[PDB]
Design a protein around this ligand. Structure first.
Ligand SMILES: Nc1ncnc2c1ncn2[C@@H]1O[C@H](COP(=O)(O)OP(=O)(O)O)[C@@H](O)[C@H]1O
Lengths: 252, 195, 242, 51, 244, 195, 61
């Protein structure tokens, strides 16, 4: 129950702060506890049993008494048969860890007591009460607004401006300009050679201009409509000059 | 050969103006400089119509618009204040985050803790008001956009590797009880007017 | 915690694929393969001998689980099943091995072209390879297009949100007359397409695109220019005068 | 107290080793995020305390 | 014909730009625009065409199959390291150990712009080496997601040169509409959320560039769509466990 | 009970900080007030390591970084002011605009008004060095976009109905104009090498 | 739902639950009012309507 004791002090710190926050005459139940140098977190349930446990543990002689007897017992041949390595090791150093755990708890209690004492100072309990109350009022009231309308959601509210930052003054002298260097040369090259297709391979261009059969189709259809007569392939080539030779013919 | 403000002070003021806020947990040195000489800093910022809002409790100095008597209000109209006035959807998230920051602050230790909340935590809270868009991806995108707008206001940080955000202390001074009351009164008038 | 889970997982995967194909048919039913034909899909099941040997082994395992012999018959039946798994694992590319341990190999695939109004199948390619190089390229290019459209469409929406798809030498075995139909099908699915074409087919795409990126190498430095077809022709004219 | 990062890694490794199991719904897309999410479910569940 | 042309870009995001910096054989900064009514990448074989697609497929998939167009069926020859280093394995004639175009410290960036009714979504990626090492783990990555039009790949590179990775983190902090993910897993999850498509959708898109090596409907379906999801590895684990 | 600075002076200084310059042709009222009380504005800007650059001939006020001794620190840094390096194309376009502005100043006397230029005149100059983008449509698009970027920096304005853009007076002060000349010489020398 | 997120030791949550249960009891007491039936009866939250159509022409006739 070492852990259980710490939980109690945490709760006692919780309950103590609530009383300070939730009580309307803070001045009274603050000085009565601040001028004092007692525990201020006296959780008499588990937490005073720990105080008694501390007193017995701190007594010398007996604690060293066990530690010697333990190792005597762990040394017995049957002890290895009873326990195992983990259990044997844990039992052997038992008194050491009890003191460490007892130390661990004691610092925690001292810390929590110091923290709660610090909270009592700065007299912010009143503000927490007023702010906590106001927020619950605002949040419950905001349920009456219509949040599906952008007009409402973008409405301006009268909240003040806190944390105004003056930054980025123009200060015309602030501007600095590119200086000749390797990257500057590279940038010039990229700008010039972009959209510079002269060196582009020839074949790219040839594949660029090929028979566009969509235009050829309509021109042919118009040609047949005008003549409106059965036209052979040879005649069509004569009338319509193919710019790609067999490519046009395959379409026809 | 001429009157020059102390170099420590000039550096502190510039850092204050550059980031808008100075936090002890991040830049403790400049923080103390401004704190040590609040009069000097206030004099520097007076020409700019900006005033410093101190919070020794949280170790947080921030710059706010200074209105002499009644500069037609519209503090957001100040020439040097960038960004745009928070809208209803952002304000709803600010309250949602602020309600998270108040809860963390109640359980606050004695050192820096940097209140954090998982992004997946805010989804159920928002969906109640903005409705169900149809899919988790749609609502997750919606949440990320809102958090991104807020981060411009300095109220949060971009989600980290665990999908967790950090709520900055400036939220405690934005949605403070004074400003919350003003917003609640404005919202109530909006509800009555619509009806 | 094994074997049965592995076998169930594979059978579950096949069920997902059958559902995906079923829900992909509805997307294709909105687009006409031919002017008024449209295309549908059929899954069917593989009848490979290895699967039948598996079903016998699974039946033996199930029957063995009811024997009261201190897990002796259950162990033996499991041993046969795992041996079958390793045998397939060792020969990880045999048709029998793939069908046993690959979700998309336990079921066949077949395309069927129907009539828009007359629901009877008009031409069912029940695998039935039986097709020219162009015909298969026509079916595959269309089937992929339908698959891409469905994948990019958010659930419950018939318009993809990521409208760009990239094709790299998509058409090489089909005539210019059938290639245009694929581009027609691609557009009607709502997919913006960026084609990478070889030196050939340049006028094949000239009727279905409005601009081109010209990639020319100048040694060890590649360059690109985004020029409209009209501006590309003007470059050619300067070449003809150069 | 185990640092949160170390637990996230240790939990993530265990998740991957059982990705095949259907009961665990372990997603191979990003186990480390799944590992972190799982811990938070048990931090707000009060099994463990984050400080 | 033209009337249908206007549908694209209305209900969907269509790629409308690509920028590269020291990617593959595209030394320096190059920019390519894409039309909303289709676009063709044309040029002499082996100039840059398949490199351009790979730059885009990297931004999209987690493990892109580079050169699925020609190497489809077997493992790809090139990889991310080569593109960053700009190796020229194929192109030889005086090859001095593969012509590593950028052997020393180098930075490569690739950005893709997608638009829909005036809304811009720019993906990005910064990959740089600090030394001559060519191991995968020595490449530093910074995936970038941006919706602000002012966040262009030129700006990201300008930030990197000025103050390295430290300035990059600072820029994201103060930048509106910018997200930077040091690990690609988080960045890909962001893409899925934005486009509302699972990982399969983008992995298929990558496989769409290797459609050349196609065969009967069976091989198109079992190799192109409906990604592997095979259980050949789980069988080994089950078999090994049964051995115990 | 305070010593609040004059409202007009506060307005001007905030105006100067937001835009970084004040022009008599544009803001005659604000420009005049600064002239009347130059000592106050310089005193206001001193804590920010900034200063106002008076130029009566051109009727232009600009803020210059008034740094410390900063021995030969050519890489000076100012928290409020962010240094930017223009692109090669932007550099050349600025260099072309800079030389033309001086030519107009010589041809009409110092302190000229509205040193304009025509878009069709700049295209041949850009085409000479940057090369041919590939068509008249592209050449215009490249030039227009570059002008857009420069206007963002406050050196030129958007084009009027007559396709003319006015060089702003700010071009006279450009910190290190020598490097602008050097680039143009390097650019011309390169082209002469090609031809 | 909104109250479930408040940190007040289950006070706002209790109040909202009280309102809901009061509504439930109000409906239960008047167990045949149209409002109560709609609130607490599955087959009363939705209307019912018939439509005669054409075998081939799918438009409602
Ligand atoms: N990462 C790389 N590995 C090998 N060669 C490369 C790489 N990047 C560019 N190259 C070279 O640049 C050219 C790229 O040719 P490419 O256009 O991309 O292929 P394709 O013919 O399919 O269009 C080739 O000559 C290639 O050798």
């Amino acid at each position: 129950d070492f852990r259980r004791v710490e939980d109690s002090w945490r709760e006692a710190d919780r309950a103590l702060r609530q009383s300070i926050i939730g009580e309307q005459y803070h001045r009274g139940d603050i000085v009565e506890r601040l001028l004092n140098d007692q525990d201020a977190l006296l959780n008499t349930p588990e937490g005073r049993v720990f105080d008694s446990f501390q007193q017995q543990l701190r007594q010398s002689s007996e604690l060293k008494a066990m530690s010697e007897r333990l190792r005597v017992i762990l040394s017995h041949p049957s002890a290895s048969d009873a326990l195992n390595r983990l259990q044997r090791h844990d039992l052997r150093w038992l008194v050491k860890r009890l003191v460490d755990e007892s130390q661990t708890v004691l610092q925690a209690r001292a810390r929590s007591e110091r923290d709660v004492r610090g909270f009592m100072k700065t007299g912010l309990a009143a503000e927490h009460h007023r702010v906590g109350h106001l927020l619950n009022e605002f949040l419950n009231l905001a349920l009456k607004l219509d949040w599906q309308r952008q007009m409402i959601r973008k409405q301006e509210v009268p909240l003040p401006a806190v944390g105004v930052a003056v930054t980025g003054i123009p200060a015309i002298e602030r501007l600095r300009f590119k200086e000749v260097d390797d990257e500057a040369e590279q940038t010039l090259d990229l700008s010039n050679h972009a959209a510079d297709l002269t060196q582009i391979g020839d074949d790219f261009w040839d594949a660029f201009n090929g028979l566009d059969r969509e235009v050829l189709i309509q021109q042919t259809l118009q040609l047949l409509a005008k003549e409106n007569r059965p036209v052979g392939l040879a005649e069509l080539a004569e009338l319509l000059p193919p710019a790609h030779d067999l490519e046009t013919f395959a379409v026809w | 050969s001429e009157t020059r403000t102390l170099q420590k002070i000039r550096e502190a003021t510039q850092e204050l103006l550059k980031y808008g806020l100075l936090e002890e947990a991040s830049k403790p040195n400049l923080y103390r400089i401004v704190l040590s000489h609040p009069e000097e800093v206030t004099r520097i910022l007076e020409p700019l119509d900006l005033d410093i809002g101190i919070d020794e409790i949280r170790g947080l100095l921030y710059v706010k618009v200074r209105l002499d008597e009644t500069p037609a209000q519209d503090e957001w109209a100040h020439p040097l204040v960038r960004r745009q006035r928070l809208n209803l959807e952002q304000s709803l998230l600010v309250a949602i985050l602020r309600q998270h920051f108040v809860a963390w602050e109640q359980e606050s230790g004695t050192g820096a803790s940097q209140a954090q909340i998982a992004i997946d935590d805010l989804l159920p809270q928002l969906q109640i008001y903005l409705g169900d868009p149809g899919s988790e991806s749609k609502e997750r995108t919606r949440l990320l956009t809102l958090l991104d707008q807020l981060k411009g206001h300095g109220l949060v940080t971009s989600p980290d590797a665990h999908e967790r955000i950090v709520i900055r202390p400036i939220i405690a001074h934005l949605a403070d009880p004074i400003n919350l009351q003003a917003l609640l009164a404005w919202l109530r008038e909006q509800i009555a007017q619509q009806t | 915690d094994g074997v049965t889970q592995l076998l169930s997982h594979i059978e579950h995967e096949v069920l997902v694929i059958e559902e995906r194909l079923n829900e992909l048919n509805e997307t294709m039913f909105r687009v006409d393969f031919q002017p008024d034909r449209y295309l549908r899909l059929d899954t069917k099941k593989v009848v490979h001998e290895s699967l039948r040997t598996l079903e016998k082994a699974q039946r033996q395992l199930n029957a063995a689980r009811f024997v009261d012999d201190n897990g002796e018959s259950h162990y033996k039946a499991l041993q046969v099943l795992v041996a079958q798994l390793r045998d397939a694992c060792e020969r990880n590319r045999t048709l029998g091995a793939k069908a046993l341990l690959d979700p998309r190999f336990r079921l066949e695939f077949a395309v069927s072209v129907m009539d828009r109004q007359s629901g009877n199948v008009i031409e069912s390619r029940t695998g039935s390879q039986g097709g020219s190089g162009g015909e298969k390229e026509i079916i595959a290019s269309y089937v992929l297009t339908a698959s891409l459209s469905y994948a990019l469409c958010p659930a419950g929406s018939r318009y993809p949100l990521f409208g760009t798809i990239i094709l790299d030498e998509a058409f090489s075995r089909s005539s210019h007359a059938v290639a245009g139909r694929i581009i027609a099908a691609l557009r009607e699915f709502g997919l913006h397409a960026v084609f990478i074409t070889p030196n050939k087919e340049m006028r094949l795409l000239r009727d279905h695109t409005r601009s081109a990126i010209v990639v020319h190498r100048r040694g060890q430095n590649s360059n690109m220019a985004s020029l409209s077809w009209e501006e590309l022709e003007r470059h050619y004219q300067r070449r003809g005068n150069a | 107290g185990i640092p949160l990062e170390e637990a996230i890694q240790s939990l993530s490794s265990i998740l991957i080793e059982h990705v095949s199991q259907e009961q665990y719904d372990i997603n191979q897309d990003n186990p480390f995020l799944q590992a972190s999410r799982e811990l938070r479910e048990w931090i707000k569940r009060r099994l463990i305390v984050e400080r | 014909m033209n009337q249908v042309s206007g549908l694209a870009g209305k209900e969907s995001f269509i790629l409308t730009r690509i920028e590269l910096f020291n990617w593959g054989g595209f030394h320096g900064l190059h920019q390519a625009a894409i039309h909303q009514d289709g676009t063709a990448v044309i040029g002499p074989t082996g100039s840059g065409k398949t490199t351009l697609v790979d730059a885009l497929m990297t931004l999209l998939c987690a493990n892109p199959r580079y050169n699925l167009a020609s190497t489809g069926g077997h493992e790809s020859d090139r990889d991310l390291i080569s593109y960053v280093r700009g190796v020229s394995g194929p192109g030889d004639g005086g090859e001095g150990q593969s012509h590593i175009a950028r052997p020393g410290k180098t930075v490569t960036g690739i950005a893709a712009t997608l638009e829909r009714e005036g809304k811009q979504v720019r993906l990005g990626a910064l990959l740089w080496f600090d030394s001559t090492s060519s191991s995968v783990t020595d490449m530093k990555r910074l995936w970038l997601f941006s919706d602000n039009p002012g966040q262009t790949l030129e700006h990201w590179l300008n930030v990197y040169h000025e103050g390295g990775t430290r300035l990059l983190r600072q820029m994201e902090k103060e930048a509106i509409g910018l997200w930077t993910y040091p690990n690609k897993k988080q960045y890909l999850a962001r893409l899925r959320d934005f486009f509302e498509v699972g990982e399969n959708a983008f992995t298929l898109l990558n496989r769409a560039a290797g459609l050349k090596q196609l065969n009967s409907i069976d091989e198109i379906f079992r190799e192109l769509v409906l990604d592997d999801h095979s259980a050949f590895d789980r069988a080994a684990e089950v078999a090994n466990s049964f051995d115990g």
